[PDB]
Design a binder for this molecule. Structure first.
Ligand SMILES: Cc1cc2nc3c(=O)[nH]c(=O)nc-3n(C[C@H](O)[C@H](O)[C@H](O)COP(=O)(O)O)c2cc1C
Ligand SMILES: Cc1cc2nc3c(=O)[nH]c(=O)nc-3n(C[C@H](O)[C@H](O)[C@H](O)COP(=O)(O)O)c2cc1C
Ligand SMILES: O=C(O)c1cccnc1
Ligand SMILES: O=C(O)c1cccnc1
Ligand SMILES: [Cl-]
Ligand SMILES: [Cl-]
Lengths: 221, 221
């Protein structure tokens, strides 16, 4: 365990501010950006599902195709170093091939053990969080996991001096149609767009943004 | 900006492993836990909504009350230093008083300016992410934001040497009934249970868990 002082941790964490305007001349190096991708890869996920894909949109033709409906990051599409569109797994039922592969990656591979795990996953999805019925709720469950990877990538990037902005401000149906249909980047039957993020170096200073006081957020029980 | 080297960031990030069994005698100090809550407070959220409450469940009467349906953390309820149950805002429509407050906290308070922002929020919610036809989709939108705070609190804790585990393994309807109905901790019309996390100091070594290779997660475009 490599342990940092919590004051140093908090200080670096406060580096992260949503950046809408990047220096178009400055690119994140390939090695620096793989480190950001690694924070996403290593993030936790319910049952180790890792129900995400990271679409790195560096092709300016694709950035221009999505600009008309991406008002939340319109300027950044011309100036950001990197763009990631997060995909979340569709129909991640306990009995799906995708979930089976995630179960073996947890180290559960003997057939009787696998059956017992799947039975618990079925009860969780059907009885506890109640998502097995509804395909949109099942998709939203996986989307939730991708916001963990999103948060970790942005935080880690900022601690290392690289700016970012989380992004929901786009038409989700158009984004899926362009990325999956026009450019054929993923099978939209298996994956759906969750959220996006830009990364780069800020063009100017960014003011720290307000938060509600802790006493209006924490409930002590 | 106080900047850390990315190899130092990655090394400290790798401290985080899901911990199911804590040292029951080891308590996180008040100051250290305030630091953890602060990581969640400062987390970003869509339109700065901050649609979360953090219920800190330190009362062992409450912990024992939720244990029978909390199989995902049954042993940790006896041994964890701290437990946080994350609530997400219900019915966070563009025209709700809660969203009005978050908009003023962004520094938009002139009535014509506020009116124009709320018009954009309405279009975002109705047309882009499409969450205004279903109260569950609206609630799930807020739940996604809470997983950012979850990710940041666990990573930051781990970087400072404090173990954690994210938790979905409980009956969600029972959790709301006990926390809101039996113990009156929140108004269930206004807030719903999103996810939980335990925090403490691990009782034994934890093996690093596998992840899919980056080449099966990253789509270069
Ligand atoms: C949202 C969420 C909920 C989870 N729920 C639980 C749970 O209820 N019980 C449990 O033992 N672990 C749970 N985990 C931990 C995962 O099993 C774990 O993150 C995954 O197997 C990867 O292992 P690692 O986190 O140690 O790298 C949860 C993880 C996430 C992100
Ligand atoms: C899921 C999510 C989506 C967001 N969408 C956008 C967006 O489309 N456009 C944008 O300018 N900012 C967006 N933001 C940034 C928020 O406005 C910002 O986090 C919040 O106002 C607080 O500012 P700070 O992040 O600088 O503290 C998003 C944030 C999150 C977490
Ligand atoms: O990740 C896990 O092990 C898990 C997730 C949900 C419910 N129970 C266990
Ligand atoms: O946070 C924001 O400012 C935001 C979120 C979604 C869409 N447009 C803007
Ligand atoms: Cl900016
Ligand atoms: Cl453990």
């Amino acid at each position: 365990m490599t342990v940092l002082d919590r004051e140093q941790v908090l200080s670096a964490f406060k580096n992260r501010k949503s950046c809408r305007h990047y220096d178009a001349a400055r690119k994140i190096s390939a090695e620096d950006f793989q480190f950001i991708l690694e924070l996403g890869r290593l993030s936790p996920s319910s049952v180790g599902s890792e129900p995400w894909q990271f679409v790195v949109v560096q092709n300016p033709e694709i950035r221009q195709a999505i600009k008309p409906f991406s008002w939340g990051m319109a300027d950044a599409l011309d100036t950001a170093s990197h763009l990631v569109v997060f995909l979340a797994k569709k129909n991640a039922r306990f009995d799906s091939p995708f979930m089976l592969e995630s179960l073996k990656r947890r180290g559960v591979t003997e057939p009787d053990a696998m059956a017992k795990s799947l039975a618990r996953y079925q009860a969780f999805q059907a009885d506890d969080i109640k998502i097995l019925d509804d395909s949109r709720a099942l998709f939203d469950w996986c989307c939730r996991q991708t916001y963990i990877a999103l948060g970790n990538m942005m935080t880690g990037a900022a601690m290392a001096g690289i700016d970012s902005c989380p992004v929901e401000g786009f038409n989700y149906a158009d984004m899926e149609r362009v990325l999956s249909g026009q450019f054929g980047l993923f099978d939209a039957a298996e994956w759906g767009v969750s959220v996006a993020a830009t990364f780069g170096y800020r063009v100017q200073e960014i003011a720290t943004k307000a938060r509600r006081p802790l006493e209006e957020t924490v409930i002590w029980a």
